[PDB]
Amino acid sequence: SLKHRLNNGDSVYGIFNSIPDPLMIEVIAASGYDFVVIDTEHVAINDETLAHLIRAAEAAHIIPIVRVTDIIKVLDMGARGIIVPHVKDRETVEHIVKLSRYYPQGLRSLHIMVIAMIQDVEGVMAIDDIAQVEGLDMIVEGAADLSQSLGIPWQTRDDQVTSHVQHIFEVVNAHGKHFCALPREDEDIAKWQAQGVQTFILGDDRGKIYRHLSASLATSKQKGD
Amino acid sequence: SLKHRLNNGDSVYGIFNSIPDPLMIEVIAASGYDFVVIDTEHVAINDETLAHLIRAAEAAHIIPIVRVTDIIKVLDMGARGIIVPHVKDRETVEHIVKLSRYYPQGLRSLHIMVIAMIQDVEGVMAIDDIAQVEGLDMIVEGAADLSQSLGIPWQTRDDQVTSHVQHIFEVVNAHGKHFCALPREDEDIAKWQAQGVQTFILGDDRGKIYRHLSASLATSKQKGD
Amino acid sequence: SLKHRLNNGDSVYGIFNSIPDPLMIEVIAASGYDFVVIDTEHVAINDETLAHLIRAAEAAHIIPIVRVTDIIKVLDMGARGIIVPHVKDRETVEHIVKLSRYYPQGLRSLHIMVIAMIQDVEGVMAIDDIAQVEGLDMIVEGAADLSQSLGIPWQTRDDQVTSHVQHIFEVVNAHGKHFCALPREDEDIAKWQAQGVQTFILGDDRGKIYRHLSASLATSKQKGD
Amino acid sequence: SLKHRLNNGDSVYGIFNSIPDPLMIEVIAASGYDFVVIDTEHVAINDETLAHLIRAAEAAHIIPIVRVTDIIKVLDMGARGIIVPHVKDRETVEHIVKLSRYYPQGLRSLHIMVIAMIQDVEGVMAIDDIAQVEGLDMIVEGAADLSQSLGIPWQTRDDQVTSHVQHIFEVVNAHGKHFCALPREDEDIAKWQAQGVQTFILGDDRGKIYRHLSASLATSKQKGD
Amino acid sequence: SLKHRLNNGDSVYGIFNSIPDPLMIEVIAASGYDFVVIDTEHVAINDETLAHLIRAAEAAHIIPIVRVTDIIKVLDMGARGIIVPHVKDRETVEHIVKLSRYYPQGLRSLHIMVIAMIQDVEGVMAIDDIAQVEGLDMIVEGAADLSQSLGIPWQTRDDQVTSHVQHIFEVVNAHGKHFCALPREDEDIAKWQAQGVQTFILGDDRGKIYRHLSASLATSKQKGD
Amino acid sequence: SLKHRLNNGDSVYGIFNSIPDPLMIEVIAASGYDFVVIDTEHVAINDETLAHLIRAAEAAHIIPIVRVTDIIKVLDMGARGIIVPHVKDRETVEHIVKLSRYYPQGLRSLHIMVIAMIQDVEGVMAIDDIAQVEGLDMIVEGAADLSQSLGIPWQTRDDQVTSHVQHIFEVVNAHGKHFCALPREDEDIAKWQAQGVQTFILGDDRGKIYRHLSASLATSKQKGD
Numbered sequence A, B, C, D, E, F: 001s002l003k004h005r006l007n008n009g010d011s012v013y014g015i016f017n018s019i020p021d022p023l024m025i026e027v028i029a030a031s032g033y034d035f036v037v038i039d040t041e042h043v044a045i046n047d048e049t050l051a052h053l054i055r056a057a058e059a060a061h062i063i064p065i066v067r068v069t070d071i072i073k074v075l076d077m078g079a080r081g082i083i084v085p086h087v088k089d090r091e092t093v094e095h096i097v098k099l100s101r102y103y104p105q106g107l108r109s110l111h112i113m114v115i116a117m118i119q120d121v122e123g124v125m126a127i128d129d130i131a132q133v134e135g136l137d138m139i140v141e142g143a144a145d146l147s148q149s150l151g152i153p154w155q156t157r158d159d160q161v162t163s164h165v166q167h168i169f170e171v172v173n174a175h176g177k178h179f180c181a182l183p184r185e186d187e188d189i190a191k192w193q194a195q196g197v198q199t200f201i202l203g204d205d206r207g208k209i210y211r212h213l214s215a216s217l218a219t220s221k222q223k224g225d
């Protein structure tokens, strides 16, 4: 379980999955990733295919986490965690929490990680509010999308964007909630770890595959003469 | 067209596709690859999915080549080329050639590249025979699979295996047929190009993705402390 | 038609379908069931697969009923009935009714059973209200889910839960509406039939299949020595 | 691009697609249609199938337009336009417009035609309101569905229905917005073109295919004796 | 049943299906066709999709006939008939016959029409041979494909091709076997019917749909000015 | 592993799977079955669906065995065993064995159970021959299909059919090969176990589900009055 790793002092490393293919899931698992975030928000993916991917993740012994926007269905498929994007108010979080629990004291019939991602400045302002919900386990930083929402390209990582992120960690960590970082560089990892952060999402598969392939091919032509 | 590139003095670069997902096809096209070899031999892939991939390749402006073992169906799907594995005798090639042509003087109803891959030592012995069929455009070297067929791991690339490969090029090039190389290193490319070789397949997507991801993740943990 | 059976004094027997496979549908039809309730609420099922199941039910001559939560789409697929879960207020029912009718006096373009299931105590309180909508044909008792919503395990069927159910029948039957029971035992059937009840749902396929198989296998090992 | 045609003085002809098959898309493209309106409102169609159709349209060089009711997902699939049905208020249009734009000044991440269809009399009354949104490119007349919403069969095309349609064009054309007509006869085309209309949707594939086939078969039996 | 129609003196009309979509099947059935020939030879179609189409044909009350090249699987799917293409020798027919029968005296486990199509001149020469197999019910003329196999375009329907066809009927009809014609014109129907022919396949859906659509659209532009 | 169970003195119980749905697989696993025989011979099942089922079996911790008639593909999908039907000669077995092994000394690239099923009297006669192949692990009795092949209904289990079966065990057990029985009654299990038999297939899911459901429903109506 993902909690189970975090309670042992373990660092866990994950990646976004933009390609709804079971072989890609098995490839990620073989690469050493502790979990994979199956992104259903920006992927045209059938419900049965999502179930296929969750089964594939389990058979490959990699933790299936699904980024949603039907919460019941995904959790009924066997997802061990739910990342909810663009969380602004606390109303959203408490509703998600009881969407993931049993009747009578929930809206689901018969240790899943309830995760909220902060990607709008509104979510940053209500962070003290948001990060105290009973049921919320993890809060994921989304500095890039947050930057883009402020009319500021993430390419120039301004101080204000970074300030909003560090303010998120401090608040989240103050209530004993888990923090998850999205480091752009591999040395931002060591910086977060020293602060106590254990959970890290390292980009998305489609993004890293394009970068490696196009560059490797470029060198292949370059070396060819 | 692939011939059309080869007739202009152009070098063309391709890759094996082990993941039957249209997004992977579009990723390969965006990486700069001139063609993609959709491998249907070692991929559990539905016939409608294969058609989906060929459409995806066309919309991404990358040349669809299918490695088979139903030749009609694939060619009816819009594949611009057929790579046939484990070709040993000439009987096979001539049959494939007329499987790709019109009635009356073919077995197909209403510039596709007819490609044969040499992966067994039997194919190496009948190479002078094989590489003269009217209709055969390209012969693909498969040194690794050939090595494995000789009870010799490809990890140790022996002289005999390399000798069988260079004998293939010389014979194939003598009859004005196209040669396609599978370089293990990027400097084997320059060596083939100096001999006149224009077509190159650079590994398989699944293989390169595993190698990049697992290593990048390893460095990510390494840098983390 | 399902109404057509009910207007003839016929008893009709159905079952919940938790396995979105056309063969399972055909198996249910061959077992003698008058209808099958394709459960789309707790089944990861593609929209095209649901259409496949409805076609399969029709070709097997078994009445297709779909339990929803897109009402138009299901009815456009050929479903002869709609079971709506967790109905609490009357506002819901009247909206469903006109979701199943023609323009101008509906929200659907060009004898379908409109069915509401009571599973929350709120639905029990508004039962006199709910069971008088023009357009509502059937009301399905859901004692188990109702029990679970009251913090009471259905395993102990308390008097209060049973009281809420019998109060539902009396009210529903008073307005000439059809009642559908979910008997836990096969002798609860005779009791409902004596009251005039004609419609019965006998569990779910997945539930009965697990119970039969696991027990039969257990006896198989037991007999083996 | 569709705008690009309209800015050149070109007339463009499209058709509704009720059959979610890539071959049907390719058939439409080969018939000479400039665009095809993939109708997802009254078609049981998987999300991955919709992506398949958009790829098929692109490879067949026909413009993919999707009629919706997930706007992000369709636009992420590569749709060049969105037709939104039953637009009544302006609130709807402005929301759709910013659903199709970038953050910060939209709700979509990283020349698409924003199209609204008028099918209710409410949409006709708010037409001066609706047809001035910054971001709205085209307004599609839907006289038949509008007729059916007024308790009047479209079979008798009354003056009032036709009046509501001509009032739509005049208002829409006054704000420099594109008008799209649904002519029942082929001579209603010349009438709209003289008014400046360039965009025309000629029925739906399923409708025209049934009409041609059933009639042709009827003549086939008739001629047979 | 198809035999059942033929034994009553009924004429039956069918069409080739090149589009593996259940809606297309239902469209054909609604057009009045007695049967539909699901062409699996030149259609990329999954096995589960073929089963979907057979179910769709049954629910639409149109006879499912499948043109193959796995005979067991199709017959296990519920196909009421099998059309086998390019039959040359009698060995083929007798094998197909016992592929469609029960063990012990067949190769299939637990009134299907066994149909052979003549499309090569070899099949024409062995017609007296072929058309006497115990188990063979129908022989389908394929003049066009036969013409194309003789290096002669079907566009010019020569006397020799027509002679081979009329020789087929005479032989087939002499052994009390059913004849099926593929008339290019609707008056070739009356000619065959006078000879006793009852079964007629009128082109393919994809072919007729392209012809109607492209022409209708052409007139639409023509009328527009 | 299945061998691993058999080498420990463990009895293993399996069932035939006629319904290609992952939920059915998970239901079988939960019922306590040690393995499931995914029957691809009499099931319309896509190749990707078969891969889905194998993943589902692994995630449910039940051993995936596939009954075939593409051996490479299934084994590449992760099947832990292959049951080959209607084995008559030894030529078949030796070919299957080296279809499941590595190059050079096989036809497969980079503890799987190689299983042969005897269902024809020809297989019974060559049993001393068949059951000595190096590579063949298990031989499955198929008395019913064998009976049906002898023009004898399995409903009357004659002495000759039973004699052919007991002759199979004796021969198979003499060469230290694994025997797998298909008991019609649960007390035929104890009889085989006393002879040393450890592997048992208890019918098929579809068969047992029909029998339980139709009977249970019958009692439900019977009890109802």
Ligand SMILES: O=C([O-])CC(=O)C(=O)O
Binding pocket: A103, A108, A109, A110, C041, C042, C085, C086, C117, C119, C145
């Ligand atoms: O909704 C139903 O019909 C019952 C159920 O499983 C729930 O959602 O609590």
Ligand SMILES: O=C([O-])CC(=O)C(=O)O
Binding pocket: B103, B108, B109, B110, E041, E042, E085, E086, E117, E119, E145
């Ligand atoms: O086989 C047929 O029925 C006709 C055809 O298109 C071919 O294969 O030449």
Ligand SMILES: O=C([O-])CC(=O)C(=O)O
Binding pocket: C103, C108, C109, C110, D041, D042, D085, D086, D117, D119, D145
């Ligand atoms: O919405 C549309 O475009 C037309 C239609 O069939 C409806 O929903 O009444």
Ligand SMILES: O=C([O-])CC(=O)C(=O)O
Binding pocket: A041, A042, A085, A086, A117, A119, A145, D103, D108, D109, D110
């Ligand atoms: O929602 C997210 O996680 C990020 C994103 O691509 C967006 O929707 O702006």
Ligand SMILES: O=C([O-])CC(=O)C(=O)O
Binding pocket: E103, E108, E109, E110, F041, F042, F085, F086, F117, F119, F145
């Ligand atoms: O092949 C089998 O395993 C049994 C069977 O149904 C057949 O093909 O006669």
Ligand SMILES: O=C([O-])CC(=O)C(=O)O
Binding pocket: B041, B042, B085, B086, B117, B119, B145, F103, F108, F109, F110
């Ligand atoms: O066939 C190929 O192209 C190579 C391969 O993996 C094999 O089958 O040994």
